[model samples]
Target: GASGSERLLDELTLEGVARYMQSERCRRVICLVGAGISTSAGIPDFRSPSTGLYDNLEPYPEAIFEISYFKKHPEPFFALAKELYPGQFKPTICHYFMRLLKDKGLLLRCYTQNIDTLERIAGLEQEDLVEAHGTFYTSHCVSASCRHEYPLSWMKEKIFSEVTPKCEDCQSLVKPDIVFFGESLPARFFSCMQSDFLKVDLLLVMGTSLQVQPFASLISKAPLSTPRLLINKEKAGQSDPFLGGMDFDSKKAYRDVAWLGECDQGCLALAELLGWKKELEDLVRREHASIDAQS
Candidate 1:
């Protein structure tokens, strides 16, 4: 049941999207992102199971992320955390593409399922981000009532020291704000949804298979006239398993477009189409050079 006005692209191709963008109708664009964007930086979409991240690392790949298991046997979680602590990985071209959008005043907000915080490192402001899955940016006490917070630096120190971080107030274990298997998403995730989608001009969903809940349902939140685009290795957001009957390219779909391929490659191609190819390349080149210099 597609329920909105049919906003057809003139040509239904990459060139069509570029033309639509240049027509001055696409002003406030929001991005719904996932691990696919960060995978190029050596960040594994860990939930994909035992993908060299959990081999001999744990018996059950997912158990380390479970709230109950961490409360009892926390070592496994911290071990992985220490290995993959933020700040070491470099941002990819997919990230700088969003940076380019912000510079062009096209990015409205970025709703991401990523905990890696690469968006922040890529020069995106905190005000421009909605980290739905939470991030290692902050940590909190496990004690419900004494939910005191700790800085990312504090967690890093303790994890590197082989000490399970403890709450300063109540002596309980402190864990990063990343949502555990049995926990809830951040409040900001829901609050922004109330107003952001109503005015969004376009929804650029990238690097995600639309596998996670509520995050997947966000595809349906935008106003009917808002165009939706998917950029990833595979065509997604059509026939969602969690939310059955969600189709991006139904026979009558006029507003949805799919650019199926590698995230960075497709992003680079789209940037070329939008007339920002050199700008995006320079940004990526500058950032990569800076990273290499530090190394």
Candidate 2:
């Protein structure tokens, strides 16, 4: 009961999270999002013990999202196609909340582990974002050669109908461009982020336990002088060699904000606490100023 009540309050006040967000030290924030950030929306994340999307599905020895698994047996991936592919989901407050960061020009870059593509709907520009897991934006051939693209509309329809779509050129199965378990990350993901890390003053990671390799390792790449913060439902692995073994003086290199709760409401409460709502609104209004000016 005590833990339940504590969680309720964390959702309500957004407690420890808001404190770090409001601090002046968090300028030029780099937002890292995972599936948890979008769970509040209709889309579901495969991870998360409580409301993870994978819980209800028929058991697979390997998660269907794995690229290697999908390559061999595309049936299982298509069997649950409707669920894995986006449907009537809309952006959550967290999605809109992240958009605000760009408006304020405080956002360095958004690296999301989610495959949902909600960030695109929220008006995030390509350069300012890295959909680390790939997105619904493009689809490529499943065959080694005779590769050709699949239009998003056709793929969308096939996904909705629960029919496995195939590539036009080779008739190979079509799949979302998401990076599968063995897939290499997009090269642009690395290059652009290196650029951001060099220039960014702060890094604000949210809604993910940075335990996923490669992505999790990015925290260590940020300039040591730049601060790093974490916001997630739970703490990242403590035994992380990087987080540990910092000399007493090096400990001041970066501060972490370990927020515990849902990402959307946590961010809203943070915005309210920081008195950023008005500033955020003003920024959005300014972006829409051409229309307003014409009217």
Candidate 3:
């Protein structure tokens, strides 16, 4: 089944992905994204063991990405902040492709695992994206009486100053808007996702390993007959089903293509193969003459 995706493309499965995308067979495409997608921007993820963001760092471990761990000690969170700060990175080709999808009205939703908030920078609508891992974009005081939201830019400025910014209202220590482990996902996340799943037709997974929970499970919400496409370096166990008891081997690990090599380049190749080269290429290079002039 692993090699099948490559063969599928050879036998025109990629054309299938493209064809399906063109027709009603690909009505609404939801992108399941993760850290691997952001690597192109020089932002490191947490799973690679070597180049992973949390891998080289010692002390708090990757658990700090979770909400619960940050509550006890915030140093680890801030320690990683300098690397994840906004404007510190830019959107990758994949990000621009997604923006193009939205602009063309082909995109349904983008469920991303990265806390980098690059998708927002790429111009994907707030309603169309679910930053499942949360983001460094917003924050609040832990005190119930002090639910004031702080802008990420302010926090970044303070963090750059090498100070742990505390909430002015309650004087309680502050953290990014990202949800850490053990903390429940934000309520808005569930609300927005529930509506998207009902109407989604094609599910396009990109850059993520799909190892993490809840976010990884988003694929399951799509209908079985819905065409699925995955982009990753290693396989996302493409044979597996989004849900249990499907005709395709439930343990086959979903039928996603291993998007080996550079994330942006791989996506560009796939898009070109699909005959969508012009639209996709222009978007990726940031020379969207058609879109930039649009009112």
Candidate 4:
């Protein structure tokens, strides 16, 4: 059953979200994340000004991520994959914040649109995570019948090299598990979100522009009474004059949505207000320190 809105507080600020986190009742905090959370960790979002992945892509910009295009020319895609693959970067405070939620047992689940796999690196286990767009943790042959999956190590070697990779068994081009434009999203995304959103008491949406379909529609899936906090550089949905029009589906709409600017800044303020500043800082520091040690 949906929670009653009467018990919900109207304050839609960082302090408000922190207050909710500090409270005893709202323990099931479901977070919906995107590329914005990884930006601070040196991973650029697809749409950033100059250095974003989309801006610098060669041959064909948008086609690089399309499954059809990759099947034809896997080189350009893998060429960029070597640079973006996991392990080179460290998770940010925002990532730690999610881990903190899980540590405290307040996290219901983290539904992420990013393929960066940073959440996994931040210590979030498979059970508590839904990599909505898939990840680079694995790869597979493009052949439907002989879809032999390979580990990250196999893909890594090929990605960093000068040639496109293929399945040893099938001779078909291989690509990472990332969801290309023409590919269907993971099945878990559908099943998990349907149940997760219904049980959410507090929804934290971060980093995404909310322009992408199905993924963006997730905010509306939660009960209207569920308090949604949007932490990003810009306001989503609200700025659009066309939203909430005559044909707008009210059941699939979010009310009482709060906005917080920038992922790291908002998280820092919330951590301080929640008295988790020290813990959050320590988590991030320890991670980077460990990385430095490795280097």
Candidate 5:
């Protein structure tokens, strides 16, 4: 049941990713990451049952993240923040992989959905990152016109004290730069992402469910000619024809690959294939030692 134009896609797997990494054309790599990347670092994702953050919310599961509900009852979100806020956790091997890409000069940008800031701890530069869903790195006044930015220390201090932070200028409640349910995404996510589609030579999508948007829309924006690789626990974007397949088209010689598994394992596999196994292991050891000493 094969068309003359249809060919086997076995080569477009991990081997393809390795070949692409080794090729001279492997430059300007763009990555899209999600919460799964940091789950190995003791962070819990939102959608998982029983152990997920949503399962522990007060009153209602979604009220903690919805902007309208947060405006009226901010205590829930503050309480959640006190428990899940950034800085306490360390980056995983997957995070280190992103940093390694930068070190090798293959990284164009890493667009991440997690607000954990592990990428920063892993040493990826701010200019090389686009926090697509925003981050806890900064906060601002909720009021549009009187929006004044505040630093991580300020937000952390107030959240840990179990008090709602108010903007100094507008006397309005301040919120983390994270995109609340009703809030719009960051401007950089849109502008830089569009440009990334034009310039990126290879795309590495990892640790994401590809269910959220407009972040998920990024996968489809890449030109069909560009090689894309997905490393996740399972297939995503299956409902979308453009993103569902491992290859761009059976009729054409396009390359796409999917490697299913835990993020840490997947990246470790990739590092081994890229001849970076020792470097990756050494980096992990150094980071673990540093964190232990700091603790």
Candidate 6:
């Protein structure tokens, strides 16, 4: 396939993505991410069926997150919640990569599917991040009329003690604000996405197969001239057999680069090239040591 030299360099490898970042035109960098980035941080795979969570969740599947199912059987949901709650996992190398981008004044924003709040731990301030799938930082009464708020600490206390938290006002389930299967995403996700994609010079798609939509559709939201990079375990969001979309590797989608590997490894490689490897490693070491001390 021909390289997308129109706006990108005349190459489409990691070097291409790295080298292009040095150009004066590549000012505004933004990214869309998914669960993969947190896999190394030890978050379970909720979206795909593997030997981990999905396989063990017999008779439930991800329906544990479906709004309707949760109203009936929230025990499993809360139980699993303890598995990947905000206090549990530390941010990974990929997360610090986003922070590094922000510090360099290169990152404009991050749109993420992760509900674990790892991006928050990675130092992406509230405004700098869009949690497309919602987050557990807050809770709300599921009652349609009495959507009163509760703090995350309250929810955790209730879950750990095996008490299903209910609203004091309406006595309804007090679920974390994380988006459920049958719910709409945060309005902010839609709003920021429309505005951010318009100016993005480089798009980073990480840790997701682009299997889910609305969020998945975002890869196509950036202009075809904007060079996009994929850092993931698999080639994702390939164009349709006949419909034509992001080709991932085709000449028509030469603007897209797929740097196939683990999300953290690929980010490290790019960091090495971009002269941030030393800083990134030091960051991970310090953060890891801190987490270890607490444990």
lDDT of 5 by residue, 83-174 (tens): 87655668999999988999899999999999988899899988999998999888999898989999988999999888889999888999
Q: What C-alpha lDDT do the candidate models reach, one value each?
A: 0.84, 0.67, 0.70, 0.78, 0.83, 0.84
lDDT of 6: 0.84
Summarize candidate 1's per-residue lDDT along 1-295 as a digit string, tens digits.
2445546467556777778877778888899999999988988787766457666464577788799999999888898788776557689999999999999888899999999889998989988999999998889998989999999889989999989889889999998989998988889999898889977988889999987898988987887667788888888877735633234556666677889888899889889988899999899999988987884
For residues 224-253, what per-residue lDDT tens digits would candidate 6 score against the true structure? 688888999988887656663555655455
lDDT of 1 at 101: 90
Q: Candidate 6: misplaced stretches above 4 Å?
A: 1-5, 58-62, 83-87
Superposition error at 30 for model 6 (Å):
1.3
lDDT of 4 at 94: 91
Error of 1 at 175 (Å): 1.0
- The all-Cα superposition gives candidate 6 an RMSD in Å to the true structure of 2.5
lDDT of 1: 0.84
Poorest 10 consecutive residues of model 4 by lDDT?
Answer: 244-253
**What is the alpha-carbon RMSD of candidate 4 to the true structure?**
3.8
Worst 10 contiguous positions by lDDT, candidate 2:
1-10
RMSD of 2: 8.2
Taking all chains together, each candidate's TM-score versus the true structure is 0.90, 0.76, 0.81, 0.88, 0.89, 0.91
Candidate 4 lDDT over 1-295, as tens digits, reads 2233353643545666677667775879899899899988878776556665764564557888788887887777777777666556688889999999998889999999888878988899999999989998789888899999999778878877756888999899887888999988999999998889878888888898788878888876876666777778876744366542111124533334445577988888888898889999999899878876874
Error of 1 at 158 (Å): 1.6
Tens digit of per-residue lDDT, candidate 3, span 1-295: 3423432222224555676566644557788888888887877665676765554465446666666667777776786676555444568888888887887788888988888888987888788878887888788877777877899778888788878878887888877777766778888778977888888777777887677777777777765555567677765633254533212223443433344566787678767876767987666566435434446
